[PDB]
Amino acid sequence: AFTVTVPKDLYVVEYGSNMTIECKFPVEKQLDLAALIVYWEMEDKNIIQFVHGEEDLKVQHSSYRQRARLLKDQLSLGNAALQITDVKLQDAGVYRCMISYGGADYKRITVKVNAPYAAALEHHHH
Amino acid sequence: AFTVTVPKDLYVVEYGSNMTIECKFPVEKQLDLAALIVYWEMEDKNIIQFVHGEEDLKVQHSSYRQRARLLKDQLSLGNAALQITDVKLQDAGVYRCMISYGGADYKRITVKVNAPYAAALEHHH
Ligand SMILES: Cc1c(COc2cc(OCc3cccc(C#N)c3)c(CN3C[C@H](O)C[C@H]3C(=O)O)cc2Cl)cccc1-c1ccc2c(c1)OCCO2
Structure with missing residues (x-):
């Protein structure tokens, strides 16, 4: 099975x-x-x-626009790698990778974000 | 796009x-x-x-054994219909149908389950 x-x-x-x-x-x-x-x-x-062969870049949810990308070179190695830059508290949670390639499957990844009081206070209130 | x-x-x-x-x-x-x-x-x-073209019997979660099946006849008409019998309170939630057919997509369906007090109490524990 894939x-x-x-x-x-x-x-x-x-x-x-x-x-x-x-x-x-x-x-x-x-x-x-x-x-x-x-x-x-x-x-x-x-x-x-x-x-x-192509990414629909602009459909990325607004919270991630200009912040995340797939490392295309990695795909040839069989690795779907998602790079997210400038991680925020809001970024914490469960990620899902769905892949179709002569069969289909998906997996879950859990992300935890540590943050100092200043960032936490902003997240808390705003 | 599919x-x-x-x-x-x-x-x-x-x-x-x-x-x-x-x-x-x-x-x-x-x-x-x-x-x-x-x-x-x-x-x-x-x-x-x-x-x-075949259902995977041993892969279905235990809570759904004997209660859920895909209506195969419907597939040819482009309809993936999931039939669930004997609905439980545990069945309430968000369902996802993921389909690969010369392209891939998924959708979410929300199910709410109404129930009498006795069933609800047992669910509540
Ligand atoms: C992902 C996908 C599927 C996934 O369909 C399957 C999932 C499966 O499990 C999912 C699973 C099961 C248990 C735990 C996790 C986690 N955490 C994940 C298995 C059970 N699987 C049998 C194998 O052994 C692997 C095994 C398993 O890993 O458990 C078999 C199949 Cl067929 C089906 C159809 C379309 C897409 C898909 C792909 C890309 C898309 C898309 C949809 O739409 C939008 C655009 O892009």
């Missing part, structure tokens, strides 16, 4: 830092981009949509 | 009753069963896994 695997299902990230979260998928001889679909979301909010 | 559609977003069902929840996907002329994958889940629990 299986997606996750080397780390838990990530601890410091507020303001950047993170790369990964989902692995099997690629046999060489990757066929045209047959690949990669989708990332966090709590029903679209983050990455890569379809048959 | 799109899955749900005519009905919300289902309100009575405890002990039956429900059929539907997700629609486009089938051009004749269904190519080999390319189709239909997956149904609620809160990460596997309900249905239709791959290769």
Whole structure:
């Protein structure tokens, strides 16, 4: 069966830092981009949509616009890697990677965000 | 772009009753069963896994054994219908139909379960 695997299902990230979260998928001889679909979301909010060679970048939910991207070079290695920069408290939660490549699967990754009082206070109130 | 559609977003069902929840996907002329994958889940629990034209029996979550099935006849018409019998309070929540058919998409369906006090009390513990 087509299986997606996750080397780390838990990530601890410091507020303001950047993170790369990964989902692995099997690629046999060489990757066929045209047959690949990669989708990332966090709590029903679209983050990455890569379809048959192209990403619909602008559909990324507003909270992530200009903040997250898929490392395209990694796909040829069978690694769907999502990089999010300038991590916020709001970024904490359960991420899902949905992959279709001659079969389909998805996995969950949990992200925890540590933050100092100043950031926490802002998040708390605003 | 491949799109899955749900005519009905919300289902309100009575405890002990039956429900059929539907997700629609486009089938051009004749269904190519080999390319189709239909997956149904609620809160990460596997309900249905239709791959290769066949349901995966041992993969369904225990809470749904004998109560849930995909109506195979409907697939050819581009309808993935999940039929659940003997609805429980535990069945209330957000369902997801994930479909791969020469493209991929998913949709969410919300189910609310009405129940009498006795059933509710048992659920409450
Ligand atoms: C993801 C996807 C599916 C997933 O369909 C399956 C999921 C499966 O599990 C999901 C699962 C099960 C249990 C735990 C987790 C976690 N945490 C995840 C299995 C059970 N699986 C059998 C294998 O052994 C793996 C195994 C498992 O890992 O448990 C089999 C199938 Cl067919 C089906 C159809 C479409 C898409 C998809 C892909 C990309 C998309 C998209 C939809 O729409 C939007 C655009 O992009």
